[PDB]
């Protein structure tokens, strides 16, 4: 408030070079002049972390500092942006707070480091498979998974899901079919752009047909890359199989990849029955691949028609006439003892109790 007229219309304003606070209704000056550091000292600025300035970073146990150094190494060998590493170490320190983890064995803390990097990577939408991180560690998948569940339950922090398109974009560039390497015939080289388009629309088809829910995505992506790779040149590529392509691509295909392939063939048969030319041509599992573009040009309406004949697991699609039969009611307990002869089996007579000590010795 202006001390001269009491009005509250104070405005910060500067004349040519003079900063001041002026009552915009009576012209009074309430405060003028500032004191600011210049370049001559601007060149000397140092830094001290406040934690250091507060005495922290001194109570860090040898194991705790070793663990955060492990976090830094894991984050940096992957060439992640620095903010990822900073958030990762922050989460590691925060999780160290509880007694239940600081008292833990070395592999538990190792997998905690791994899942900490994994969750901070998730927070940034960055796609990253847990198998790769397990590969970068000295731990096995099972213990890692169990401890990851334990920590997410403990902290209850947000865990954004993996967006399938991002996995596709990360995974497609990994294959080596985009270059005329001498190890691979040039017959198999293709433009990667059409590759990505075909694959992402194929996996969209797989997703909307309930194939992806509750299953590993990686084999589905591999199968979709397959259907693309055969679709762009059925002239010769139709003769190859799973093992051949993964050999040239230098990839370890998952075992369920073949089953995922088979079920998506079932789906594209169900999808081809609708079209006039295909339903007249009497196509088969192998021959259908050459029309993929034709079907996916008009996907949506055809798949909506195919829904009106959904997808559910084949195992329970065996037409179960009986579903969750009601068990008989047997909650009766009798009065005090429905029988006494059941106790007339639970004890041994001395004839063989006596010799119960001289075979296990």
């Amino acid at each position: 408030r202006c001390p001269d007229c009491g009005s509250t219309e104070l405005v910060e304003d500067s004349h040519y070079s003079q900063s001041q606070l002026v009552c915009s209704d009576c012209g009074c000056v309430v405060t003028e002049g500032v004191l600011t550091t210049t370049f001559s000292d601007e060149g000397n600025l140092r830094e001290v972390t406040y934690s250091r300035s507060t005495g922290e970073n001194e109570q860090v146990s040898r194991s705790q500092q070793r663990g955060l150094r492990r976090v830094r190494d894991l984050c940096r060998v992957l060439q992640l942006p620095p903010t990822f590493e900073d958030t990762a170490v922050a989460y590691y320190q925060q999780a160290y707070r509880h007694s239940g983890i600081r008292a833990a064995r070395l592999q538990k803390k190792e997998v905690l480091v791994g899942c900490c990097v994994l969750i901070t990577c998730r927070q940034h939408n960055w796609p990253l498979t847990m198998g790769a991180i397990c590969t970068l560690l000295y731990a096995d998948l099972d213990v890692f998974s169990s401890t990851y569940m334990q920590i997410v339950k403990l902290l209850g922090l947000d865990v954004p899901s993996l967006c399938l398109a991002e996995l596709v974009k990360t995974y497609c560039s990994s294959f080596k079919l985009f270059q005329a390497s001498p190890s691979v015939p040039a017959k198999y080289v293709e433009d990667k752009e059409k590759m990505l388009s075909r694959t992402m629309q194929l996996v969209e088809l797989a997703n909307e047909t309930w194939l992806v829910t509750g299953r590993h995505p990686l084999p589905v992506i591999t199968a979709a890359t397959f259907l693309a790779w055969q679709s762009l040149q059925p002239a010769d590529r139709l003769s190859c199989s799973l093992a051949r392509f993964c050999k040239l691509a230098n990839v370890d295909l998952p075992y369920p990849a073949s089953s995922r392939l088979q079920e998506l063939l079932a789906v594209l048969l169900r999808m081809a029955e609708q079209l006039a030319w295909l339903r007249v041509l009497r196509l088969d599992k192998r021959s259908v691949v050459k029309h993929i573009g034709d079907l996916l040009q008009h996907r949506q309406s055809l798949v909506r028609s195919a829904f009106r004949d959904l997808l559910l697991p084949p195992c329970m699609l065996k037409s179960p006439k009986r579903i969750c039969p009601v068990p008989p009611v047997s909650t009766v307990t009798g009065d005090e003892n429905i029988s006494d002869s059941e106790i007339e089996q639970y004890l041994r007579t001395p004839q063989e109790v006596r010799d119960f000590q001289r075979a296990q010795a």
Binding site: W126, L128, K169, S173
Partner: protein, 98 residues
């Protein structure tokens, strides 16, 4: 880029831990490749010097090496393991503009 890098790598070919003999690690060949950018999905695309000028980036290409080392067995080999990245002089052999 063409010769001196390989000469240095040859001068430092072999490394071995004094503790636990019979374990070692050998460098074989080192390359420099072409410039590219690391976008946010563990994938890369090629760049041009002006895009680097606009985006306050660095014009550089990755350094890659093939390696030979032992872990229990000695038959472990890697072919295109990267080490780091090297800035590229414009209109040199590896540049885009040549």
């Amino acid at each position: 880029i063409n010769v001196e890098i390989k000469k240095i790598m040859k001068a430092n070919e072999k490394v071995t831990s004094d503790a636990d003999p019979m374990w070692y690690l050998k460098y074989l060949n080192i390359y420099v490749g072409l410039p590219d950018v690391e976008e946010s999905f563990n994938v890369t695309r090629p760049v041009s010097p002006h895009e680097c000028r606009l985006r306050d980036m660095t014009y550089s290409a990755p350094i890659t090496v093939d390696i030979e080392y032992t872990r229990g067995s000695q038959r472990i080999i890697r072919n295109a393991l990267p080490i780091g990245r090297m800035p590229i002089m414009l209109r040199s052999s590896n540049c885009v503009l040549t």
